[PDB]
Write a new protein. Structure first.
Length: 15
């Protein structure tokens, strides 16, 4: 998912 990629992972670290 997006949360599997650095930028989105920094948006939501809970994701």
């Amino acid at each position: 998912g997006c949360c599997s990629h650095p930028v989105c992972s920094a948006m939501s670290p809970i994701c």
